[PDB]
Design a protein around this ligand. Structure first.
Ligand code: A1LZM
Ligand code: A1LZM
Ligand code: A1LZM
Ligand code: A1LZM
Ligand code: A1LZM
Ligand code: A1LZM
Ligand code: A1LZM
Ligand SMILES: C/C=C1/c2cc3[nH]c4c(c3C)C(=O)[C@H](C(=O)OC)c4c3nc(cc4[nH]c(cc(n2)[C@@H]1C)c(C(C)=O)c4C)[C@@H](C)[C@@H]3CCC(=O)OC/C=C(/C)CCC[C@H](C)CC/C=C(\C)CCCC(C)C
Ligand SMILES: CCCCCC/C=C\CCCCCCCCCC(=O)O[C@H](COC(=O)CCCCCCCCCCCCCCC)COP(=O)(O)OC[C@@H](O)CO
Ligand SMILES: CCCCCC/C=C\CCCCCCCCCC(=O)O[C@H](COC(=O)CCCCCCCCCCCCCCC)COP(=O)(O)OC[C@@H](O)CO
Lengths: 62, 275, 63, 28, 51, 72, 268, 63, 63, 62, 63, 62, 63, 59, 63, 26, 62
């Protein structure tokens, strides 16, 4: 029921856990900002389907 | 890299063929000469599978198949692009399975245990051999044997089953499906029983053989016991492999009509109820 | 939540989270590949290339 | 050309990464 | 690099090497058999001849 | 505990010398074999390639390395 | 790459997604089963026969060796698997053997007589030195001279007094009594008197009906002489799991070491 | 619920909830993908883009 | 994170990372092979060979 | 729960881990930069489908 | 990495690397075989035979 | 194995390690450079498909 | 290599070479049987029968 | 272990076996090559390319 | 080579040779049966019956 | 042509490697 | 290797065995003679197929 870790062991585990979690969180946030600026993830009410905005000759995989 | 008790048994001898030259361990694996030959046949057969993947441009474990030659080829050696690769891999698979079973014989000798495990594996190997040799001999060519593809041998099973219209009705298929279902049923029962005896609710003590015996006596009226369950399990799985042998060797060679028509041929005409 | 490691094995949590995030990176890259807009491997044009106004995301736009 | 640059770079990496040369950087 | 024979049995590495050599030798020979230019058994012409 | 046969450091050096010489002699023999194969038919394609279909007339049957058995 | 509402988009469908989820569960299940596999013999130990030391981190940890499992027993004992008495038994096990070669993975050739070495097929585990009882605290493995309630069924040969022959056909002894498992209702051992008494595991005994009509026990594992070296029982009328394990290991030793040939291949 | 950990294993509960919410996040992102209105990967238009009035949710609109 | 090896086995971590990166290098190389633009084995032309303006990545170009 | 490693063993493992992780990271960043300069991984709003920029005779697998 | 063998077994590492590189060398030689340009066994012509200019790799060539 | 690897044992293992890894690395770099001078691995913007550069009569495996 | 058999077991080396050479002789004879030029069992003509000039090996012959 | 003279005897036996087989197989390959040389010339040795179009070719 | 039996078991050598030679006699007889020229059971004519000269084996014959 | 060369090379190798001569250069 | 039966036991077993075997043999010879006189088992050079000797309207199972 208890891991048996001391408070100091838990605190060093937690500082590593915070560093890893928040480094991954921030790198992922920057990555998602870059991908969102590349192509916004969520369509507007008009959508972002190529069939609805590109001309007929532009093929769309639907 | 070695079990807590492993070194206590890692002794020389027990080889069928190999002497002390191949009598060693690489990591966990015992090698032996039959281990060397099993690795040879396995790796060469996989390299021939990769060769077929290269020549067929099929780099998909699912779409790639080494099919046997055409039926018109007969027993002749085929071009590697026309079933020869399948023939090479058939030799490789027979060799690798036999070498694996013989390495298991060596390991059983070294451990002083019976040869039941390589025997059961040899029953499975016997299915493979009789399917890839016995069916060609019965039907007159390597093209009647199943191919070597993860998904494509399923297509061969499909087509060979549907060659007899409704393959479910095959007597050997009915018996063997019953045997596979009974094998999974008995493995579920047996694993469940052993775990139930050794893992009761938290706070309960580990139960005994009397507990499991009275469990199945209370449950279904009969308990086959500790020895009986393993004997029955080896028997069920082996017998399902023999049923597979009979099924693959009879569908086509010994009945070219539908298995529904096979059942109609005798069962409704049994004179005790054919009137 | 350092005290979480008094009751929850950190090795379990970290190993499982790394396994799940490998799973999830594959899953999400698969989702991007499955999207024509987001399949960089096939490189389809974005509808913004052919639109004139900004489509928005929460912007109340009408046809 | 670009291919010539790639081949030269690979050769240079092979020379520098050769054990008789990469081992000169051992720090124990 | 001789000290690798303190790490590994020279006999076992020799067995693995001979196994690997047999495997790749047969694999290469069969691969050449699958080719047109290098299948000495099939005996196809070479492109240098302009058959 | 103590192995029956022991493999000393000098014995390891001697085996390594013998094995390196054996490997290099084996590689030299294999290289002579490869030189013979190359003089027979070079196995590194030139810029123009060496597909027989690219040089032989259509009366010469040329079969591609790739087969159409699995159109995937 | 069409959308397939409500079944997905491109290959991001729920056929493949239930496939992925079940493969994730199957991987977790294989990991769980491997951890359960690591409840015996783990943590791994490298081969002591090695010119190099042991790496600080040992193999067999990719599925972590789980926390040792607690078993509550009928006798009131709380045992912990891996049982440390077995681990220390393996650590301090007398080998009577040397590695054939100085590298890890080398087999062990016994130094002297391998029948008495308790090495390889003769090796045995540390087990309980108190005789096992049934649920009703009755002696689980008991000779029929004590458990008179147990009898050989009528259709089957009662081999009390039957000859026991060794590998070479020599007269190993005579069956003084049959040891049965009360819980399993099976013959566990044949007590074989030698002209002293030893035990013969039932799976090491072939009850063969001679063409005389006389039943005998053929023991392929050991010879008639080697019957004299079967580990004896500390108490004649009871056998502990340790003694069971010793006797079975002696006959297993015979399976490879009874005669010089049986440890050698057909073609070396 | 602070006394629930006197009677219910917290590591079991937390691991089970994290596993279940991983599955449920997958299944719910999937339910969004299953919807033409909500599949952001396919990016279909919203019907509000074409109708000139707010549809509402509880608004008692009539055709 | 030098203290991680007080709690997490480094051999497990390094071996699993090397196995996963072998698998992932294979998977990523195959992902490139699946892509026409990036399949070096097939050597398809790049679209930039055929457009006289830089496509950009975040350039906010329009038709 | 504890691997049994001392602080010195943990620190030398961490030196090796930082070396391997960051060497692989830098080599991979250079490799991805080379592959990105060869062909940028992410298409612009125009895309990089050959069908959308190349003439009709330029065969596209898409 | 000279201290890696104090922790990770060198026999395991060397054997696994040799086995994986055997598999990978098979996979890569087969990947060349799968490529028309790189299948030295069939010996298809390189596209450089039919182009006067050097195609480049990073060269910003245009149609 | 009753003791771990000494610094001397670990160093002599790593000597062979570095020899093997770097010899394989350099020989592979030379082999890849040779194969690259033979046929450059990475296509230019024009590509290196035969169908895009060779005449019609030059058959291509695509 | 006189002392090789002092180290490597010659007896099993010879037994294994005999088994492997039985397999190899079967394989090579089957390769010859598969070859029309070399199948003595079918007895096909040699191309040298129908060609006026010697084909040679390494002859650098031209059409 | 293997004694010095036992390794000597094994060495002569191995030399005799390998060299006898090697020389017999060299004569066998020389005879099979003189019968039909194994490796085709640039023209190849396919029957279809040289036979007068009525000689059937299995190839 | 009389000393091989100081090292190699003659009993199993002879047994394996007899088994392999039974299998090889069957295989070779089946090879002859498979051959149309050599199948004595079917008794097909020899091409030498219809030839007006000796074909030879190493004779440099021409059409 | 060169087929005779290969045959002669193989025959020379067989003669040289024959035990009655292989042992002379032991 | 031996059944353990005495000489007299073997003699009485043999008396019963001769009795049974020769009684069966003679009864079978009488039965086969009766069946042979009824219809001889072995056809003459002419055979004994109905189709070869009977008129056309006499149906034959061959
Ligand atoms: C055509 C043909 C071909 C080939 C070929 C072959 C064979 C046959 C083989 C091989 C190999 C091998 N390779 Mg190679 N290749 C190829 C390419 C390549 C590449 C690319 C880039 O692509 C890479 C990176 C490789 C690499 C390698 C390794 C990994 C291995 C080993 C080597 C070494 O050692 O290293 C060493 C060497 C080397 C090269 C390595 C290094 C680099 C550096 C860092 C740099 C990198 C960069 C990057 C990635 C970026 C890209 C860009 C583009 C523009 C996009 N490969 C081609 C395609 N192969 C092998 C194996 O596998 O083994 C196992 C074999 O066998
Ligand atoms: C339409 C069509 C159809 C069909 C078809 C058909 C035909 C033709 C046939 C069959 C069969 C049958 N199946 Mg079936 N099916 C159906 C269905 C069904 C069902 C349901 C639910 O519905 C059920 C349950 C059923 C099942 C069955 C069973 C019983 C069987 C199978 C099994 C076998 O065989 O295997 C068997 C198999 C055996 C044994 C095998 C073995 C290995 C070897 C050595 C081992 C080794 C390997 C390897 C690779 C190694 C690895 C490595 C690692 C990995 C490292 N069904 C449909 C109907 N079907 C067979 C027989 O007959 O039997 C009897 C045959 O022939
Ligand atoms: C075409 C072709 C291609 C490729 C190629 C290849 C091969 C072959 C390989 C690879 C790899 C690898 N990569 Mg790559 N790529 C690619 C892309 C990519 C990406 C994207 C997103 O795009 C990423 C992120 C990657 C990354 C990576 C890693 C993870 C690994 C390692 C490296 C390292 O470590 O570092 C390196 C690292 C790195 C680079 C990263 C860093 C952060 C960064 C800056 C930040 C940002 C991010 C993000 C995500 C955002 C963006 C998006 C948008 C849309 C804009 N990859 C392409 C598509 N590959 C490898 C592997 O897998 O291993 C196992 C291999 O083999
Ligand atoms: C149709 C109708 C029929 C019949 C009928 C019947 C029934 C129903 C029955 C019988 C029998 C029986 N048989 Mg008879 N048969 C018949 C014929 C015959 C023959 C011929 C050849 O043909 C024989 C040889 C017999 C014989 C016999 C025995 C083996 C058995 C036993 C009995 C006795 O012992 O006698 C007794 C014995 C006896 C009779 C025998 C005797 C030696 C002898 C002299 C010697 C000589 C031989 C020979 C082979 C010659 C040839 C001729 C030519 C070819 C010309 N079978 C017919 C076809 N079954 C039984 C039984 O099997 O049981 C087990 C029964 O049930
Ligand atoms: C196209 C493409 C794409 C992508 C992509 C990718 C890849 C490839 C990857 C990824 C990721 C990842 N992401 Mg992403 N994305 C995307 C989107 C998204 C979203 C949405 C909403 O949409 C989200 C929320 C995400 C998120 C994420 C995370 C979770 C992870 C981790 C990282 C981090 O940490 O970050 C960090 C974190 C983060 C970013 C998160 C944040 C919170 C926030 C503020 C809140 C939220 C909001 C919401 C939900 C609302 C809705 C909206 C409306 C509807 C309007 N993603 C797209 C679609 N990816 C990764 C993974 O998986 O891991 C393993 C990977 O690999
Ligand atoms: C009495 C007594 C005796 C004996 C003895 C003895 C001794 C001591 C010895 C011997 C030997 C021997 N053998 Mg004998 N024997 C006897 C018999 C016999 C017979 C009959 C049947 O009669 C026969 C046939 C025999 C044969 C033999 C062989 C196997 C060997 C030789 C080797 C060689 O080869 O060289 C030589 C060398 C060489 C040849 C080198 C080879 C490259 C490699 C691999 C190849 C591979 C290849 C591949 C893989 C590819 C192809 C493919 C195709 C394309 C597909 N024997 C008697 C019994 N023995 C040796 C050995 O093993 O080594 C170690 C020795 O020492
Ligand atoms: C057509 C038909 C044919 C044949 C036939 C037969 C039969 C049937 C048999 C045989 C054999 C045998 N071979 Mg022969 N061949 C053939 C060719 C050949 C070759 C080539 C060159 O190609 C080789 C290398 C061989 C080799 C041999 C050995 C290894 C073994 C043993 C022999 C001895 O010992 O001496 C002998 C030995 C010897 C000869 C070896 C040596 C040289 C050296 C290294 C050099 C090499 C070179 C190279 C590879 C390059 C050139 C080519 C080009 C392309 C120009 N083979 C053909 C194709 N078979 C055997 C076996 O397998 O074993 C078991 C048998 O049975
Ligand atoms: C009635 C009894 C049975 C039984 C019993 C039993 N099977 C055993 C043992 C025992 C006692 C072992 O003791 C042994 C072992 O070690 O693992 C536990 C073993 C094993 N069986 C395996 C696979 C298995 N077995 C199956 C069926 C039963 N197995 C029946 C039900 C089935 C199917 C389809 O039902 C499968 C796929 C492996 C995991 C392992 C062998 C490894 C090997 O051969 O090495 C050799 C090593 C390798 C890598 C083999 C590669 C050889 C060729 C060249 C590779 C190409 C493969 C083929 C051509 C096969 C056809 C492909 C299909 C797509 C068409
Ligand atoms: C008692 C047992 C003795 C040992 C077995 C002996 C069996 C065969 C040895 C044959 C020796 C070489 C003969 C080569 C002859 C090739 C030319 C040929 O074509 O002969 C074929 C001989 O088969 C063949 O080689 C069969 C061999 C082809 C190899 C196929 C490999 C796949 C299976 C591998 C199994 C490994 C174990 C005859 O087949 P077809 O008449 O076309 O069949 C037409 C059918 O309708 C049947 O009538
Ligand atoms: C993929 C196979 C499943 C992952 C695995 O092999 O096992 C995993 C180890 O991962 C690891 O090192 C990584 C092992 C697998 C990584 C590489 C997989 C692809 C190559 C094979 C997880 O096992 P455990 O440590 O017991 O988990 C403890 C749990 O409380 C939480 O996870």
């Amino acid at each position: 029921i208890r891991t048996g870790l001391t408070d100091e062991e838990c605190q060093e585990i937690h500082e590593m856990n915070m560093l890893g979690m928040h480094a991954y969180w921030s790198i992922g946030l920057i990555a998602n900002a870059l991908a969102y600026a590349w192509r916004p993830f969520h369509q507007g009410r008009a959508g972002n389907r190529l069939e609805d905005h590109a001309p007929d000759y532009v093929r769309s995989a639907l | 890299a070695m079990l807590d008790f492993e070194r206590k048994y890692r002794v020389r001898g027990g080889t069928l063929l190999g002497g002390d030259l191949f009598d060693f361990w690489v990591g966990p694996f015992y090698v032996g000469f039959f281990g060397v030959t099993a690795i040879f046949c396995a790796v060469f057969g996989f390299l021939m599978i990769g060769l077929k993947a290269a020549i067929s441009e099929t780099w998909s474990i699912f779409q790639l198949v080494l099919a046997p030659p055409n039926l018109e080829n007969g027993f002749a050696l085929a071009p590697l692009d026309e079933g020869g690769l399948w023939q090479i891999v058939t030799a490789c698979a027979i060799g690798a399975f036999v070498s694996w079973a013989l390495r298991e014989v060596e390991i059983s000798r070294k451990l002083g245990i019976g040869y039941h495990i390589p025997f059961a594996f040899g029953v499975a190997i016997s299915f493979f051999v009789l399917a890839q040799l016995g069916r060609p001999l019965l039907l007159g060519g390597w093209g009647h044997a199943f191919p070597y593809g993860i998904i494509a041998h399923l297509d061969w099973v499909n087509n060979v089953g549907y060659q007899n219209l409704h393959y479910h009705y095959h007597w050997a298929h009915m018996l063997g499906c019953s045997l596979f279902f009974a094998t999974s049923f008995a493995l579920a029962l047996h694993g469940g029983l052993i775990l139930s005896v050794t893992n009761p609710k938290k706070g309960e003590v580990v139960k005994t053989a009397e507990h499991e015996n009275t469990f199945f006596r209370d449950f279904v009226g009969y308990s086959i016991g500790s020895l009986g369950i393993h004997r029955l399990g080896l028997a069920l799985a082996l017998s399902t492999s023999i049923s597979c042998i009979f099924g693959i060797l009879t569908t086509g060679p010994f009945w070219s009509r539908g298995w529904p028509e096979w059942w109609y041929t005798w069962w409704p005409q049994i004179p005790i109820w054919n009137w | 939540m350092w005290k979480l490691w008094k009751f929850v094995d950190f090795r379990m949590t970290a190993v499982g989270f790394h396994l799940f995030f490998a799973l999830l990176a594959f899953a999400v890259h698969f989702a991007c590949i499955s999207s024509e807009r987001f399949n960089w491997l096939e490189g389809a044009p974005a509808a913004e290339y052919y639109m004139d106004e900004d489509p928005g995301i929460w912007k109340r736009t009408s046809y | 050309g670009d291919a010539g640059i790639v081949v030269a770079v690979l050769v240079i990496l092979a020379i520098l990464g050769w054990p008789n040369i990469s081992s000169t950087l051992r720090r124990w | 690099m001789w000290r690798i024979w303190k790490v590994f049995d020279p006999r076992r590495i020799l067995i693995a090497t001979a196994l690997w050599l047999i495997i790749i030798s047969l694999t290469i020979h069969v691969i050449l058999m699958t080719t047109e230019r290098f299948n000495w058994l099939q005996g196809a012409p070479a492109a240098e001849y302009y058959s | 505990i103590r192995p029956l046969r022991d493999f000393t450091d000098e014995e390891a050096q001697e085996f390594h010398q013998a094995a390196v010489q054996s490997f290099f002699l084996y590689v030299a023999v294999a290289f002579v074999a490869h030189l013979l194969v190359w003089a027979w038919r070079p196995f590194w394609p030139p810029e123009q390639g060496y597909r027989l279909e690219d040089f032989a007339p259509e009366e010469i049957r040329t079969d591609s390395f790739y087969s159409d058995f699995l159109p995937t | 790459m069409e959308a397939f509402y409500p079944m997905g988009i491109a290959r991001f469908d729920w056929g493949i997604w239930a496939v992925i989820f079940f493969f994730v569960f199957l991987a977790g299940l294989i990991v769980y089963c491997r951890r359960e596999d690591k409840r015996e013999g783990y943590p791994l130990i490298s081969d002591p026969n090695d010119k190099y030391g042991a790496p600080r981190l040992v193999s067999g940890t990719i599925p972590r060796v789980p926390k040792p499992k607690t078993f509550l027993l009928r006798d009131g004992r709380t045992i912990q698997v891996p049982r440390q008495e077995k681990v220390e038994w393996d650590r301090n096990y007398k080998l009577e053997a040397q590695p054939t070669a100085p590298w890890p993975g080398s087999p062990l050739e016994p130094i002297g007589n391998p029948m008495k070495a308790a090495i390889g097929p003769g090796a045995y585990a540390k087990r309980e030195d108190k005789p096992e009882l049934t649920w009703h605290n009755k002696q689980k493995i008991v000779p029929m001279r004590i458990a008179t309630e147990y009898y050989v069924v009528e259709d089957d040969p009662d081999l009390r007094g039957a000859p026991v022959v060794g590998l070479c056909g020599g007269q190993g002894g005579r069956v003084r009594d049959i040891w049965v498992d009360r819980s399993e209702c099976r013959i566990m051992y044949y007590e074989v008197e030698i002209s002293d008494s030893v035990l013969l595991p039932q799976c090491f005994a072939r009850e063969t009906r001679r063409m005389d009509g006389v039943w005998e026990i053929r023991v392929n594992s050991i010879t008639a002489e080697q019957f004299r070296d079967v580990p004896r029982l500390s108490n004649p009328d009871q056998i502990t799991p340790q003694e069971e394990d010793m006797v079975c290991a002696y006959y297993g030793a015979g399976t490879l070491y009874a005669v010089p040939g049986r440890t050698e291949p057909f073609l070396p």
